[PDB]
Symmetry: C5
Subunit: 349 residues, 5 copies
């Protein structure tokens, strides 16, 4: 509900945060070299500026992108094009890669699937690589870049050795890796839903299926173009070093394909999943139909026979018929049996 993407009647240079989360704000900077390590959390937009010309690869984090003054001030000092800055403040946008002679701009989307409930939230994560610096813009607190920090903080891996271009890889690779966790959560919900559809189905089950299907399509709407997002990098990378950045992006490019294939795999399953429900229900009804019919067929005629001898008349042959009462109960028994014999037959005649 709500969250309407409009920004209508506005010039392209307009800077407006269209997101849900304008609650909190934070800036974090992690500068590093093979020798040293440093990091701090400030709300000052001025302190992060002189790091632009820093030779050492610097990782800049900006949370609470709702602050337009910060975005503009940062973009102006880095010479970032207004439209690029505008795309950042627009939380409703398809992930992409826009190459520039000065920098590289990339839009990405984080995801979080709720437990004991069916909902998929999405926080847009934009990043910019220029010189030795890498920006990162988010909405709320929390990310998947925590182990990236640790590997830098604890000097764990080659991430300390190589530059910010390889850091860019690590940041992307960390996010792409998170999608696998998301898929497994969704894959569980499918298996749970599959069971509910196959056996013991009930009300609201159809609703859950529609929820899953709709959420699954929206998921592909993000992941599917994300393939081209990484496909663009793998075959271009003009400022990035070919000797290092290229073969690593390849593995990430391999991941997003497997992820996209995994998503499309689910859509095919969920699509035919609803028909499975419909097939089961009709089968249940068909079973119930058999039950109702074999009853009404072995009583209604026998009920009618009782109604015959139930109706009073001036002339009744039963008084002249010895042992009529038992044989009437007996002849109905034969009728009851032969119908059952007539039943257990070959249906679909």
């Amino acid at each position: 509900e709500k969250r309407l993407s409009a920004k209508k009647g506005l010039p392209p240079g307009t800077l407006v945060y269209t997101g849900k989360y304008r609650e909190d704000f934070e800036i974090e900077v992690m500068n590093y070299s093979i020798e040293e390590f440093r990091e701090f959390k400030t709300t000052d937009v001025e302190s992060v500026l002189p790091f632009r010309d820093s030779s050492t690869p610097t990782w800049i984090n900006i949370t609470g992108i709702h602050r337009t003054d910060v975005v503009q001030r940062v973009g102006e000092f880095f010479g970032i094009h207004p439209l690029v800055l505008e795309d950042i403040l627009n939380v409703h946008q398809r992930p992409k890669v826009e190459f520039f002679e000065n920098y590289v701009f990339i839009v990405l989307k984080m995801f979080t699937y709720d437990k004991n409930l069916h909902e998929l939230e999405s926080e847009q994560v934009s990043l910019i690589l220029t010189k030795n610096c890498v920006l990162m813009f988010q909405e709320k607190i929390g990310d998947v870049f925590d182990p990236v920090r640790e590997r830098i903080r604890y000097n764990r891996g080659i991430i300390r050795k190589k530059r910010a271009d390889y850091l860019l890889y690590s940041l992307i690779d960390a996010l792409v890796d998170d999608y696998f966790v998301l898929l497994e959560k969704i894959d569980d919900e499918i298996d749970v839903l599959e069971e509910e559809v196959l056996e013991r189905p009930e009300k609201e089950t159809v609703q859950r299926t529609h929820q899953l299907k709709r959420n699954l399509v929206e998921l592909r709407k993000t992941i599917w173009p994300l393939r081209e997002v990484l496909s663009s990098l793998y075959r271009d990378v003009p400022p990035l070093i070919e000797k290092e950045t290229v073969p690593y992006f390849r593995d990430v490019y391999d991941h997003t394909i497997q992820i996209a294939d995994t998503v499309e795999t689910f859509r095919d399953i969920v699509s035919g999943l609803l028909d499975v429900y419909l097939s089961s229900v009709s089968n249940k009804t068909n079973e119930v139909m058999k039950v109702l019919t074999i009853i009404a067929t072995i009583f209604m005629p026998l009920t009618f026979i009782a109604g015959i001898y139930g109706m009073n008349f001036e002339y009744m042959p039963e008084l002249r018929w010895k042992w009529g009462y038992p044989v009437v109960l007996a002849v109905m028994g034969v009728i009851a049996v032969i119908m059952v014999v007539y039943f257990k037959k070959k249906k679909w005649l």
Copy 2:
């Protein structure tokens, strides 16, 4: 209904307005430069002519395109090809871009979705960029170019600084932006329809679904080729300046993709939406089936038992059977219970 696109048995140079709205007519001209601003509304076709050679970027609006004399007179003075003029008067046509050495011709479509009713009207908007002049042809009064006027009128943005080629961007960008508003209106109708399908469904609901689906397909029929319309510009723009016009068209080209993706996203949802209805109805019927059966199964046999003792005979063992009347009422109670015990079982047997 009606609005049949025929114009059969006519030479290609024929100028005929095939639209619904021939009611009113208006011409508006907005000339501007970084120094000054001017605009007026006249019905004279002669007054707008000398603006052709105006160095300042001039925005020409022509409403009520039903007037063929105006279209021809304008096209002749601008040296516009007859077929191009013919395409304008044809309101039933797929949006496109036809490049020429003198000018650039673009067909576009406005939309308006009705509230408390399901209908999608479409007004074709054609425009031509030549020299420093930009034409715009419409059917009826009203447009999405009002903020474009204001930004020029109030000197708000870079639109005053740059030329008509950037104005072309602003005009297109203003229209493309309107589609987002249209989608949100439709997205609401889906959510409303989804609820009606999922819970408390009734008559005419299916009709609304068919209305939405049909209107949604027609929507894609316009938006889908509009992608190529802007894709053509982004990779060509021969007369337009590359230093400015190109990177701005890119953002618009990014918008139409997201819009087209948003539309196709809906089609997948609406497609399986009808099966959700069918799945629910069969489930309801299956529920009703269970109700009817468990009733007829616990009465018809007991009804038959009553018919037995209801039928009169010469020999009745009930008179020789002490307390037969209560035990008959009692033995039927056991039958009633064990069936319910037989019920609440595992269905789909």
Copy 3:
């Protein structure tokens, strides 16, 4: 039925008319220049021959192509390849364009949809452009080229000025224009069928849908490759003048795309149209189910109660129970009400 396309066990040079209409035969020739106009109807195959070297653009019509002797004699004198002549006499063939150094061969298909009945007939129209001459081969009398004749006969348009290559455009454009008329006829049938499916559905409705769907697919089978047919011309035209023929073919090429899009638009509608019928029927059945159940549930138990006091016994407490007859009628009233109160509930439980 019938109309089997076989011609099996035959050499490629075989000339056999495989069409339904061998009834009548006619040859018409319309030669013209910017100065003069001439036309006549003869059955002589010799009189049309010397027009081959005529400098003036000549339009040759040959109706009743069943005459193999005429086709061969014409093809031989024009140096037309046997296979091309063979393709002409084959009425069952997909429309195409085969370029040659001497001429250009094009297969096209006319259509006529019947009113008050569902059927689509198709007459193959082949044409050949060589030098200043343009051939046209048909099956039966009647065509859409009547206004083409009039525009030439009355000197109406530029068709008199330009050559046979532009006449080729006019001939094609006249035929492509006819498809719009066909679509509108079909579009009406859809709207009529949609109404019948949405409201007041009955028997044979499904048959009409299957008829429409099947006829619609066959329609696309012709129109869809016809796109490439005109796409081939627009990007090649080796003998045709680029200064004139090319930009006009473009408009026709734009038409066939809109037509093909219009057809595919219908297929998507007709596809889900059948499910709408199925959805409505099940809803009707579900409604009928509710009616039947709420009846059997408020009578069968009350019927059983009557059967209790209907059954005769030696001991009846009713004689010792004052006002039993009214209170039995009263207690059943409560049962009848509470079930209705139990009804009007939330279904799909």
Copy 4:
């Protein structure tokens, strides 16, 4: 059933016939020139060898390809690659074209649809064109190359004039032509099945549909890649003469497209054909539902009324009510009528 394609755990040079027909064996050779004609049937593999260097175009037929000794001996003397020979003995393989400097290898599939039964048999036909010689390998006796023989035997057509490369055309064209006969047989079965689905449907009808659909898909599995098979030839033909072989292959290449389009046309029809059956059945059930309900609604209440006066009591107001017996029969008549008046209403309420 059976016919399992395995040949597992075998080197690529293994020569094993995997077909069903190893019953009979035959070799036929038809050598010809514009002057003379000769043919004979021998079982000798040695007699066919010296024809390799024959200047005259020679047509070699080998039936009963189960004989591995013949295949190897022929392949060795012609210098044919082992894998090519292996592909021949493999009857389960997708049709293709493998170009070589010495020869051209083509896999093709014959078909035969049974009457009064639903089954599609397929015999793989492989052929090799080298020098002036053309090989042809089959499984069983019988083919579509009989008129090809006759046209050569009777010197009927240009097939006698041109070389084996044109003979290759004739052989292929003869086979491609056979598919049209196959389609017409299948097209009849569809029309017959359509009628059975539309009107008077019964048991086993669904089975026939599943048989047709499955057989239709397998048909496309052969014809669809056969398009590329001929598409490969039309755009390559390195050893074949361009002045003759190319334009003739074009017509065949046009045929296979029309055939493939005809097949895909059927799949779309057969797909929605099953839903037509389902739509009809539900409509029948809905009709039966109406019948059952309008009965139970006009009797069960009236039956209950009879049960009221059927139940015996100490106090009966009927004895004090004059003409009660007729008016009870009368008041039930009103109830019976008003329900029918209540019926014939607007359903789907």
Copy 5:
């Protein structure tokens, strides 16, 4: 269940076995030349090292890839890139081909379908070709490379003559051949399932269909990209000899296409297979509906007639009507007959 692919928060150089089988470990080496043959089974990682520079083509087998120490030690000595080694230990990955100047890395997947149960296990098989050496990494004991060993062990075929590059072919060809065996197993299950759906359907049948469909999609998820896997080799092979390796890969490349076509063929069948079940069930219900209705229609009115004469009144015309009891039994007979005459009619009215 389980087998979650995560490895989150880890540097790219991390070596972790993500497979199910860490149970057993084995290394086997088969070195060979046209003169000699040798093989042995050791657990020593050092003994396999000096074979790297061996001129003779050497086949190295490593089972139980869970041992990370072996993988790293082998990769380091061969100069294998860490990411390549990482991909090996990742059992959840899409098959691919990554070319390098030193070697060629290929991921492949073995399969085993269970009998009397529906499940598809998959063991990833990775291999590396460098110099004259070919590595092969597996999870558990058992493979399809047994006949490959035998053909080498018994000097059976050309596999002994040619080098490891041709051995690479044999290894791949042996695996690709196994898929045919897998398909035949699945094809049987389809035919068995088809029968169960067409005739004598029951509970759990739908579940089996959903199992087959889901397993079939996952099967394509592996085989479909495997086409491009071999398509990459066939058109590149930089270190492999063109004179031998290329034409053999072609046959394998032809196999994987036929396999992929065979899989997609099944998906189309299985898709419409569920609707066949739904169509049959509704037909059964429709049959049961007819049975129930024709009963309730020929008794309920006759039951009501009995209730009339069953109801007691002060005035009964039956005593004044001679032979009323028989004629009541007679008039009901007429009603019973005419309804049956009314039945056996044209349904779907």
